[PDB]
Design a protein around this ligand. Structure first.
Ligand SMILES: OC[C@H]1O[C@@H](O)[C@H](O)[C@@H](O)[C@@H]1O
Ligand SMILES: OC[C@H]1O[C@@H](O)[C@H](O)[C@@H](O)[C@@H]1O
Ligand SMILES: [Cl-]
Ligand SMILES: [Cl-]
Ligand SMILES: [Cl-]
Ligand SMILES: [Cl-]
Lengths: 984, 984
């Protein structure tokens, strides 16, 4: 009877039908747009020859003139618009070509004129300028991320404030952990991160509303938003010639300040020739401290608090704080306050409301009935809605400035905490910002801090979109992720702690922090992770104020050797090996870093190993969904069993934990890398015993992998040991019998390839075979997939590949973080393999993939690829090409590593191993590099074509002296050194 | 420096300041209103002599004319409006009385004219007629609750659909458990139960929006909502003379229908003299199946689904369904469809949208830019927003009807489930409702079902608000709560299973179900609860599809004897005792009901007892927050330990579980009552051994309580056993040392009193002493509070007094359910105690408390007491008098029991023990009563004053024959019997 047609099953798209019905009567061009005219999809209305894909028919439909005109034909007749000369026609299926009326021609030309920039544009400095009326490519595209600065203060990692801001200023604002200052929204749409009133305000004249910051109507003649590094600026011009500017940023910490403050400055310039008697009403919604009760008991969230008013020394009202009854919700104290600056005079708000129902009344939030006449009623209940009102007269050509301060004080930074601490910190804050210029100076301080932070590595290529994208935007995103891990963005809203393995973010940012004098902060981060390693070598999978999930995941500890290796090789500071750091086991016990790093390797190399001497997989490793072993155990369960095994069998600590559990080949590669890392560390430490021991275990573990993990045409991913008859014995190479694609023999994991190379196990020949498999079955038009189809239920209890349509996340997406780890491999191999044609090919795939993740390139075809042109996104949908959030991802970290690696920079014990791999079409690459006691200017020139040191003639000069050593010293003479490389 | 003033600490209110500054320059009357003019609260603007408390100043400030006028004085000068003649003046502090201008006078008169009805009014049938522009007393006041009907179908309890509807039709709609059809909202405001688009629609004319169902602007000239029994009707008149009616109800189940369907009929009458070419766009938001991911991973909720279109036999589009990839979210299938009826023409929607961003575009939800021209694009992602569009021309005087059907099919009612089952059931539904009159006939069926249901008991007094409030509205709410327990309302939105102790709701509704032929349904509910009792006698604290929390709470099982007692005594159907029913222990074991009820009594009377032979408290009993014992155990942990105590001490089953755990005096009363119930059941069963056994255990248990729980002043609540030196030994009477009020010796729990009486333990003298304590320390101006202040830190410390401002929930509220259990005791004692003055006072307190909970009386002073005039609410705030939600509460169940008890009806073995307690001021009471094979008309007459059978002269007549036996037979002659009682 009734039939069902899904979005994906729908037989034909609008543009396909448009091409069918008009393609050989008019030139539809490279891009067109169309909509079905009816719910049965039989006819289309379309428009030919657009500069790019864009929702033009949608905007045309919003236009009363074009809309009414089209009804003379649609829905019963298909039509296409077409421009010839500079005049528009409408074409029918019967060949008629009708010059459209002038008012329609004008509307159509006005609509298509700037389609090329409908998703905004980037400034030379990489700032995203956004039209507030234009449609969004996706829910992450128009988003900026803000962060405070707790460097030099306690618990910098856990207490740095962070904010989400879209083009309209919507979003929310957090202090420590997931503590909400302004309310987050957890509702149906990705686009809604915050309660809708947050950061918004209204203007009134003669009692009538003339402006709302989140409503663009006919009385708004210009409205743009600019997302820059750590601030957002939003500008409006009214038809009445008011010029309104909003600037939003987080206050860097200063002693005595609240733990979190977000400043929004509102500038109102009267660009007309008559004074205007105006008022502002500034609104927002405090987050609840009782976040779980939003789901479980909303009435609880309301009755546990009340509104309270704040008054300065002179008895003047300054703002609002939400007052809580339960002690657990009185350890943070929120506030909002406003200063109105009008020539000489400063004033505080004259009125307030705290009841959303009294505020909106019979109206809407966009048009609130009580917005002009606030009732000065303190709500006995929550929620913590606030409205602050103040009148001002602004003379012709003059500007009034309204500075708002919203934030939170906390016990997390203050002993003997009470709301009295907040009142003192708020006073400190308001006195600091008493003078108008203090706001501008603080913004400039933020700008300069990030400008100086990025000087560690600066491309200068004349592609300013690339230069700014890397030098500024990617540098900021890796800083942001060092503090925030994956815990807070537009759609990352729930209680994420800090994953042990996101120590990865520090792999890239440590060099930046060291080169602005914060080496000690990097050590504090290392020691903090070190303190989440247990005595036996496994690690808490997660930690925030406290660590948890002991040895739950098998890869965690091994990543820390990469962090220590990076730090020790760059700094040559071996002292950290002697630091006494808490063991995660507690009871006030500390272990020297050296012995915890020796323990980490012993856990994965000797204890928690399987039948082949490879590290056990346990619940899973880096790959969230390799739950192969249904009866896994974490490291504390394994510890108690391991010790009773040793007494059962009379064994010795260090013996293999006997089991039939599966093994992770990826952990084997991580371990092998770890062991080489420790050997190099000990060498620099002149620890002769440890360097010999590791150098020898490295050879052993490599033997193990080569012998037991190379499987025909790939390094396998997992070795299976529970089937003594041989039913299944590996996964991740031809012949594993586990594929789920008829045309594919075997399952192939991109990371088996990547980590076999990054750990320096795979031979040139094994690289060639795996790259061929990659080209055939993992390389898509949208990049490198994480894995090929597998049917893992053949050995385990499902709940993995069963959740997503093809193209999303685990059902075959391009996971950009994994794609970047693979690029890191391709780049490492391209520098070293003997076969220059293999190297050329791998460098081609590297740059192909980098081009598909570079955020600024999202503006080339934004309504198809979406993403965000300043901030990385997690994955690409391989069905559509859409870059899909979230906005925090190891993609950014490894992209940074990879581009610096391709520029030729690798730090080794003896200095900088210089080996750049330029693009074939490039003929020069210039960049600057800071070091702690020197700097460098690098210049590389080459003919068009593939050039690399391994296989191309070259001359290398350092400070004008041709040299042969391609390891450039790490200079300490506080001079700039000129490095020139010339390929023939 | 900075000071803080909380809502509660604010020294003076606006009206108090108005009276200070004006009360003896003008007569302010019994009610006035005022607002502070500034954020420092130094001046007020107010208005004198209102008919009741109301937010008049708020509405006056929304009025351009009056607010402009007021600025001549405010903020600097206080002012009060006052009416003399039919003319207004404004009065200043200096004495000036200024006749306000005519346009101000007109606005003021228009504003105050109908303040008396600003919160709406009740029809003679108890329906709440509501003005859509007037302010709300609170977030529960303008709410209706809807329910389907699964009687005669499987798993009626678990599958009956339910909806929440406010005056604008906002809210949400669920199927089984917490499965959402239309999306719930979990956000900051109690007022927001649902996604804002739910149930709303737009009208267009010539491409322009002319109407949105959730926006009242100047083009709306009339807008009212009527909440009735199981439907809501909303009416609007436009300035252009369109008359729009929305009718919302749930479809009662018919074989082959979807498990849940909500019908909204939209009638559009053209009351003008010109035809109008209109279109409708009907919108909503499907709930996600991935509810937890709204908080954890909103992007997941989006990518796991896509929109899909539905087409009928002729290839015509009929609506939308959200299509899910994961199997776990494919076991329910949602739909929305619409039929447009225009004369004899029927049509289906011509267009649709499924992307909220394309729909709203540059506009707002109230004014969407894409709402007229839907794009017919199936969204590849969620969320499941939908817009369905259809054009229609309506001639002068004609009506177009648009019928919408929104719902869900489910595996819960269908084997071999897939979306093909939904398509068949949707076809069945649409065929059933193909004729226009089918919708009206189904509504009439619903109306008649509830009319017939309520016939069990019908008051016929002078007072139609009381009569409809009881006969219709309270009857409906007890029906609603029998299915829904406490699981779904305006602010009850999260996953609640059915509490074992909510079997209470059946205590009242069973009689109603039996008298419409659904005795078997009552037995099914009884058997279902019986199946959640374990062999040992404890119960799963909770159950929905399966039971859980075995013996976690100590009182649970005991309530079931009250349910069985009520059923067996009313029906005389002892057969239920012989039913073989699953034991919650599982395997495949069943036990006869008789033995599970003997087991329940044995658990609390012999096994799980403390040092005094009283039932152990365990984690808690009925009172959620008596976590006295921090090392408690549930009944399965106790069972495992009990048996190993038996083996290690040679004991026998039935011996006491040895411990120092605390004992619950409330459970003792529940057990004593349980035992009497069972003894009485066995008597009716002619089971001679069981009747003797229980009669004897009852004397024992009563001895136990009297000996060990009467504590000079009161029956204690808890007996404490862990302090063998006597530090603390009881809680709940004078001398327990646990008070936290300086002026109160002891802690007094209202339920100690209530259950000492309902179990028939307390002597006349103990009642007198306890009522005196109640009058002095538990009776407030807003009713009977649950308990007096206690400092339980002295023996444990924790919560409740930790969480709430004084007046709310556990910090001293009038918990209306507990207040009603106390009224049940007062009524029972008033009928029986020898002292007529004690009976008189207890009946006075009873009626005082009933008057504070009767919903219709919430309209006497609604802006102070709020609540809901048709549905009970949970508690009264003792600070303000506000009735605060939620809307589902044992208040409704026990209010029903109490008013029937006061009318004189108690069912006993031998019939109807008739003993009414009228109000002193009443001179007659008339009511009708149905029985399964007879009916009765009762008429009671008395002089003004206190009259009761125990102490007043009376003559009783039954069918014209004076009689002395006050136990009326339970007649079975299928005749109407006349019962007359005349007090002298
Ligand atoms: O592929 C899985 C990866 O993506 C996301 O689940 C997390 O943010 C990463 O920590 C993880 O490594
Ligand atoms: O006092 C506690 C009572 O109130 C609410 O928590 C629940 O709805 C009831 O089941 C409970 O008995
Ligand atoms: Cl992997
Ligand atoms: Cl994000
Ligand atoms: Cl509710
Ligand atoms: Cl109690």
């Amino acid at each position: 009877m009734i039939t069902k047609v899904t979005a994906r099953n729908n037989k034909i798209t609008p543009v396909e039908l448009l091409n069918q019905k008009f393609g050989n009567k008019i030139n539809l061009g490279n891009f067109a747009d169309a909509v079905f005219t009816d719910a049965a999809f039989k006819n289309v209305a379309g428009i030919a020859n657009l500069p790019m894909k864009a929702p033009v028919m949608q905007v045309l439909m919003e236009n009363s003139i074009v809309s009414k005109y089209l009804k003379q034909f649609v829905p019963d007749r298909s039509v296409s618009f077409v421009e010839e000369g500079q005049k528009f026609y409408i074409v029918l299926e019967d060949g008629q070509k009708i010059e459209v009326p002038e008012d329609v021609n004008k509307a159509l030309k006005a609509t298509v004129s700037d389609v090329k920039h409908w998703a905004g544009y980037l400034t030379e400095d990489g700032e995203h300028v956004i039209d507030l009326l234009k449609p969004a490519p996706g829910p992450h595209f128009y988003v900026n991320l803000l962060i405070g600065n707790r460097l030099g203060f306690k618990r910098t990692l856990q207490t740095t404030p962070k904010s989400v801001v879209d083009r309209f200023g919507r979003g929310s604002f957090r202090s420590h952990a997931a503590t909400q200052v302004l309310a987050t929204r957890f509702d149906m749409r990705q686009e809604e991160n915050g309660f809708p009133a947050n950061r918004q305000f209204y203007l009134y004249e003669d009692g009538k509303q003339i402006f709302y910051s989140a409503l663009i109507d006919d009385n708004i003649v210009e409205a743009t938003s600019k997302h820059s590094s750590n601030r957002t600026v939003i500008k409006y011009k009214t038809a009445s010639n008011l010029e309104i500017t909003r600037t939003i940023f987080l206050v860097p910490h200063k002693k005595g300040f609240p733990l979190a403050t977000e400043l929004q400055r509102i500038e109102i310039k009267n660009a007309s020739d008559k004074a205007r008697n105006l008022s502002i009403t500034y609104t927002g919604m405090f987050g609840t401290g009782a976040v779980h009760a939003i789901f479980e008991d909303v009435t609880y969230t309301n009755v546990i608090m009340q509104s309270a008013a704040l008054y300065n020394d002179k008895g003047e009202f300054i703002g609002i704080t939400p007052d809580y009854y339960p002690e657990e919700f009185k350890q943070d104290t929120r506030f909002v306050t406003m200063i109105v600056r009008n020539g000489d005079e400063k004033s505080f708000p004259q009125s307030f409301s705290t009841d959303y129902n009294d505020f909106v009344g019979t109206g809407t939030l966009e048009h609130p009935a009580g917005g002009s006449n606030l009732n000065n009623k303190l709500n006995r209940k929550g929620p913590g809605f606030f409205a602050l009102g103040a009148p001002f007269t602004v003379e012709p050509g003059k500007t009034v400035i309204i500075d708002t301060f919203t934030g939170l004080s906390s016990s997390k930074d203050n002993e003997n905490y009470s709301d009295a601490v907040m009142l003192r910190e708020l006073d400190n804050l308001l006195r600091y910002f008493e003078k108008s210029e203090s706001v501008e100076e603080t913004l400039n301080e933020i700008i300069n801090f990030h400008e100086n932070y990025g000087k560690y590595f600066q491309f200068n290529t004349g592609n300013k979109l690339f230069d700014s994208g890397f030098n500024r935007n990617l540098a900021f995103q890796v800083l942001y992720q060092t503090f925030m891990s994956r815990s807070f963005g537009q759609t990352q809203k729930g209680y994420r702690e800090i994953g042990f393995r996101e120590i990865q973010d520090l792999f890239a940012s440590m060099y930046y922090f060291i080169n602005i004098g914060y080496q000690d902060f990097v050590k504090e981060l290392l020691f903090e992770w070190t303190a989440n390693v247990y005595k036996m070598g496994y690690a808490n999978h997660n930690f925030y104020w406290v660590g948890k999930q002991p040895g739950l995941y098998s890869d965690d500890s091994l990543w820390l050797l990469q962090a220590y290796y990076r730090y020790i090789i760059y700094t040559k500071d071996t002292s950290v090996l002697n630091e006494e750091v808490p063991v995660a086991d507690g009871n006030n016990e500390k272990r020297a870093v050296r012995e915890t790093l020796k323990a980490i390797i012993q856990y994965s190399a000797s204890i928690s190993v399987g039948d082949h001497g490879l590290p056990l997989l346990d619940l899973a490793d880096w790959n969230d969904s390799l739950k192969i072993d249904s009866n896994s155990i974490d490291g504390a369960t394994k510890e108690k069993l391991y010790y009773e095994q040793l007494k059962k069998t009379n064994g010795k600590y260090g013996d293999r934990f006997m089991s039939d559990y599966s093994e992770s080949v990826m952990n084997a590669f991580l371990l092998k890398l770890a062991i080489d890392h420790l050997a190099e560390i000990a060498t620099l430490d002149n620890d002769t015993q440890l360097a010999q021991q590791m150098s020898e275990l490295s050879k052993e573990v490599t033997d193990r992998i080569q012998k037991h993990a190379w499987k025909e045409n790939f390094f396998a991913r997992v070795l299976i040991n529970r089937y003594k008859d041989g039913s299944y014995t590996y996964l991740g190479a031809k012949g594993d019998k586990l594929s789920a694609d008829p045309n594919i023999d075997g399952v192939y994991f991109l990371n088996s390839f990547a980590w076999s190379v990054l750990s320096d196990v795979a031979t040139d020949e094994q690289i060639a075979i795996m790259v061929d498999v990659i080209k055939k079955h993992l390389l898509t038009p949208y990049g490198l997939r994480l894995v090929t189809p597998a049917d893992l239920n053949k050995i385990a209890n499902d709940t993995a590949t069963g959740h997503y349509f093809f193209g999303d996340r685990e059902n075959g997406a391009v996971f950009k973080h994994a794609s970047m780890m693979a690029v890191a491999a391709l780049i490492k191999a391209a520098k070293k393999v003997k076969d220059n044609e293999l190297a050329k090919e791998m460098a081609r795939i590297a740059y192909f993939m980098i081009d598909l993740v570079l955020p600024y390139k999202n503006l080339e075809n934004p309504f198809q690829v979406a993403g965000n042109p300043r901030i990385s996104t997690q994955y690409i949908n391989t069905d559509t090409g859409e870059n899909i959030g979230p906005l925090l991802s190891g993609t950014a970290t490894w992209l940074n590593l990879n581009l610096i690696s391709l520029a030729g920079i690798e730090y080794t014990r003896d200095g900088i191993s210089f080996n750049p791999i330029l693009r074939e079409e490039e003929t020069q690459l210039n960049f600057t590099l800071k070091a702690p006691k020197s700097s460098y200017k690098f210049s590389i020139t080459k003919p068009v074509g593939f050039a690399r040191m391994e296989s191309s003639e070259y001359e290398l000069f350092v400070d004008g002296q041709k040299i042969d050593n391609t390891v450039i010293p790490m200079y300490t003479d506080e001079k700039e050194h000129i490095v020139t490389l010339k390929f023939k």
